[PDB]
Automatic annotation (TrEMBL), chain E:
<keyword id="KW-0325">Glycoprotein</keyword>
<dbReference type="GO" id="GO:0030670">
    <property type="term" value="C:phagocytic vesicle membrane"/>
</dbReference>
<feature type="disulfide bond">
    <location>
        <begin position="203"/>
        <end position="259"/>
    </location>
</feature>
<dbReference type="GO" id="GO:0042612">
    <property type="term" value="C:MHC class I protein complex"/>
</dbReference>
<keyword id="KW-1015">Disulfide bond</keyword>
<comment type="function">
    <text>Involved in the presentation of foreign antigens to the immune system.</text>
</comment>
<protein>
    <submittedName>
        <fullName>MHC class I antigen</fullName>
    </submittedName>
</protein>
<dbReference type="GO" id="GO:0009986">
    <property type="term" value="C:cell surface"/>
</dbReference>
<dbReference type="GO" id="GO:0012507">
    <property type="term" value="C:ER to Golgi transport vesicle membrane"/>
</dbReference>
<keyword id="KW-1133">Transmembrane helix</keyword>
<dbReference type="GO" id="GO:0002474">
    <property type="term" value="P:antigen processing and presentation of peptide antigen via MHC class I"/>
</dbReference>
<dbReference type="GO" id="GO:0031901">
    <property type="term" value="C:early endosome membrane"/>
</dbReference>
<dbReference type="GO" id="GO:0098553">
    <property type="term" value="C:lumenal side of endoplasmic reticulum membrane"/>
</dbReference>
<feature type="disulfide bond">
    <location>
        <begin position="101"/>
        <end position="164"/>
    </location>
</feature>
<keyword id="KW-0391">Immunity</keyword>
<keyword id="KW-0490">MHC I</keyword>
<dbReference type="GO" id="GO:0000139">
    <property type="term" value="C:Golgi membrane"/>
</dbReference>
Length: 179, 244, 9, 100, 276
């Protein structure tokens, strides 16, 4: 997460990096989702110009030591951190700085509406849910010392190909305001 | 989790004690690598092995670190007198023979090692579930359950949703990163939120059961705990709810 | 510049 | 392993001129294995100060080395090279002859 | 004209006397430019030529780590080769590897090579096509399997066709004043009496580079080489080489013999006589 990149659903993403040693025989692309390990995406032999496999396209440009990954039809499942890695001979991978790819969900029918939920099991602390807002909608942190606002995550119900952004807020200072 | 295994996964250790991390690579693989990782930063090299031989150990930041691989299979990284600066994720990778493009390779899930000043700060999470709002069901015709885990420390929690004894993933999004309740406090406790969303027809059915599960990683059986509070050991805190 | 590191025999 | 006896040549870096400083060289080659003891001598004594080149080998896998030192050629000294190897019954001694 | 870079690796196991020793030297033609000895108190890659020292710490610390790892791999190789042949643990054994690239006068890779020996015996060699290996015995075939699984050949083709050529061209430019400046030999003829009627004519060639040379003796203009004495070309200890060729002639017939020399720095061959 040294660099950040935001792309809209269905578009294409392009990640870049400048690796170190021009003698690297193989360049690699790994992706790491929050909490998981590194997943191998692709590799390219340094003598090749470009390599393709499904929605991924790798473009190499030696001399400049420039490596690019293009994700076609980028979708929410692609949000992660992407790392460049190089290797030459019988040595360990050398990883570059990461790039966090953030996919903005396609919201067909915006319908912003804040709702208060039943604090099941008599939970004094209340919570109001900001949901159904637009991709351009923003959620910032109320400077109120004891009013917590969470970031925005997208939810995907595959049963009906429906998506929806969601946010949550609660107060422990005994002062709640759903508006 | 088919591939390389790493034993502790999560580990808390007080400044001064020792810790040992375990790696279980694929049986046939000749080479085995250890990396270190900070918050969302690129992995850095520690040491790697050819069969049982250690080709290089220059990555180790201190002499307290000691990796080994007795018979060329399992590897173990031991740390003595762990310091606050040792807090990080430790990754293991194994390959058939080197890392050339096309050679079989697998990275492990990793092990997050939090070195704490004192274990008196460890607290498991307190989970609660909030039922959907009839206002939401009256407009969106969808039902949104929200789960809220608070007061845990460190942030060693893994949350999930279970509908009628089944772990579901559709209609779920959990916070990417916990939220520190005491922004100014250094050792502040955290809080994590999550949501599960289904049709109003599923929440209305009172025969359905919804469970928010939170796996917390704290102390192990071999840990000095003297306070009269309950030992904050690794456990699962859950909060359930039923349709209406 | 030398070959990086050869594979073992 | 294979055994191969070393070839030896003792000579000077520059055409020897009595009085003028110069370099004394003992060049061993064609031997195998690589374990070998080479020592430069003056009147039978071992001159401790000796710099040897880095171990290397020829296309046929035979090693070669250059032990050398700085000396000032003066008559009635008799510099020589004593080389002992696994393939030698006893150290082979080769005296230096400025005519060669 | 035609240059080349060459590396020589030697690993010798010394049971009961420490870990195996690893030495590595690198040559550009006949000029050694790098050395690494695993037995030095501060084992690091040290420059041996005045056209590589201006590369910076990034370059030299990269070779040091490279060599330190290679020495660990060779220690693994010695154990593996030992186990392939069921060789005693109390025996000393030698591993040698030699590789490099010939930069043809075309300015491109003319050919790359990599070959190894165990106890002075050809073990495994990279083929000229840079795609496969040739194994001497059944043990080398085990090694071939392991290298085939590792795509070792693909990494050698990329190194020999890229890094090797790229850096050889860089070295030649940095040291053009010596690597590409051929140096003709300084020559003369000495006289040494054998018997009351015999004398030796020794033809000297001193201070030349590269080492390739040819000395010929001729009486009346023919190839009188059946009774000529040639010593192996030898180093002067400073970048130049030496070589002499002797012939025994009947006293009084000195001016019947002429010495012919051939070196790259000499535009036309040199015929030399003995000046009484």
């Amino acid at each position: 997460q040294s660099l950040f990149l935001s792309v809209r659903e269905g578009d294409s993403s392009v990640i870049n990096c400048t690796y170190t040693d021009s003698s690297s025989t193989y360049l690699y692309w790994y992706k790491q989702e929050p909490g998981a390990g590194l997943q191998l995406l692709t590799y390219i032999f340094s003598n090749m110009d470009m390599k393709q496999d499904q929605r991924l396209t790798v473009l190499l440009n030696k001399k400049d030591k420039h490596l690019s990954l293009r994700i076609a039809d980028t979708q929410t499942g692609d949000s992660a951190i992407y790392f460049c890695a190089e290797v030459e001979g019988n040595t360990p991978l050398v990883f570059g700085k990461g790039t966090r790819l953030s996919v903005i969900a396609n919201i067909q029918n915006p319908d912003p509406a804040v709702y208060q939920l039943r604090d099941s099991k008599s939970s004094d602390k209340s919570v109001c849910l900001f949901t159904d807002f637009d991709s351009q909608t923003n959620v910032s942190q109320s400077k109120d010392s004891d009013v917590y606002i969470t970031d925005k995550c997208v939810l995907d119900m595959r049963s009906m190909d429906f998506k929806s952004n969601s946010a949550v807020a609660w107060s422990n200072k005994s002062d709640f305001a759903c508006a | 989790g088919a591939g390389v295994s790493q034993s502790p996964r999560y580990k808390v250790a007080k400044r001064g004690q020792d810790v040992a991390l375990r790696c279980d690579p694929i049986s046939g693989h000749v080479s085995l690598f250890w990396y270190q990782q900070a918050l969302g930063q690129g992995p850095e090299f520690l040491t790697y092995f050819q069969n049982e031989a250690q080709l290089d150990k220059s990555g180790l930041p201190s002499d307290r670190f000691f990796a080994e691989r007795p018979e060329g299979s399992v590897s173990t990284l031991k740390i003595q007198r762990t310091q606050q600066e040792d807090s990080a994720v430790y990754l293991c990778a194994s390959s058939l023979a080197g890392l050339a493009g096309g050679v079989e390779q697998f990275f492990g899930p990793g092990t997050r090692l939090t070195v704490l000043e004192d274990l008196k700060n460890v607290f498991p999470p307190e989970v609660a579930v909030f039922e959907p709002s009839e206002a939401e069901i009256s407009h969106t015709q969808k039902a949104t359950l929200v789960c809220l885990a608070t007061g845990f420390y460190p942030d060693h929690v893994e949350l999930s949703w279970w509908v009628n004894g089944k772990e579901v993933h559709s209609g779920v999004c959990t916070d990417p990163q916990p939220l520190k309740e005491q922004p100014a406090l250094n050792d502040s406790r955290y809080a994590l939120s999550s949501r599960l969303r289904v049709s109003a027809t599923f929440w209305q059915n009172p025969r359905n059961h919804f469970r928010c599960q939170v796996q917390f990683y704290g102390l192990s059986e071999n840990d000095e705990w003297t306070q009269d509070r309950a030992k904050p050991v690794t456990q699962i805190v859950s909060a359930e709810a039923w349709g209406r | 510049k030398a070959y990086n590191v050869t594979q073992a025999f | 392993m294979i055994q191969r006896t070393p070839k030896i040549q003792v000579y000077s870096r520059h055409p020897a001129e009595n009085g003028k400083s110069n370099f004394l060289n003992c060049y061993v080659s064609g031997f195998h294995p690589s374990d070998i003891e080479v020592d430069l001598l003056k009147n039978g004594e071992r001159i401790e100060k000796v710099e040897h080149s880095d171990l290397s080998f020829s296309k046929d896998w035979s090693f070669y080395l250059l032990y050398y030192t700085e000396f000032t050629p003066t008559e009635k000294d008799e510099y020589a090279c004593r080389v002992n190897h696994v393939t030698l019954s006893q150290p082979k001694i080769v005296k230096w002859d400025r005519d060669m | 004209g035609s240059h080349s870079m060459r590396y020589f690796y030697t690993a010798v196991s010394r049971p009961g006397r420490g870990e195996p020793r690893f030495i590595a030297v690198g040559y550009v033609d006949d000029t050694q430019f790098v050395r690494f000895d695993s037995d030095a108190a501060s084992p690091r890659g040290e420059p041996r030529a005045p056209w590589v020292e201006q590369e910076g710490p990034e370059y030299w610390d990269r070779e040091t780590q490279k060599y330190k790892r290679q020495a660990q791999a060779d220690r693994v190789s010695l154990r593996n080769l030992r186990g392939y042949y069921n060789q005693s643990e109390a025996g000393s054994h030698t591993l040698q590897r030699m590789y490099g690239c010939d930069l043809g006068p075309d300015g491109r890779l003319l050919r790359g090579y990599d070959q190894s020996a165990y106890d002075g015996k050809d073990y495994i060699a990279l083929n000229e096509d840079l795609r496969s290996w040739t194994a001497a015995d059944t043990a080398a075939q085990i090694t071939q399997r392991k290298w085939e699984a590792a795509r070792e050949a693909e990494q050698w083709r990329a190194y020999l066709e890229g890094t090797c050529v790229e850096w050889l061209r860089r070295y030649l430019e940095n040291g053009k004043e010596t690597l590409q400046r051929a140096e003709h030999p300084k020559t003369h003829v000495t006289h040494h009496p054998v018997s009351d009627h015999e004398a030796t004519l020794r033809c000297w060639a001193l201070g030349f580079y590269p080492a390739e040379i040819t000395l010929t003796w001729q009486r009346d203009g023919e190839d009188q080489t059946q009774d000529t004495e040639l010593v192996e070309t030898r180093p002067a200890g400073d970048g130049t080489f030496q070589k002499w060729a002797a012939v025994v002639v009947p006293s009084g017939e000195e001016q019947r013999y002429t010495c012919h020399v051939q070196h790259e720095g000499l535009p036309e061959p040199l015929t030399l006589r003995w000046e009484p």
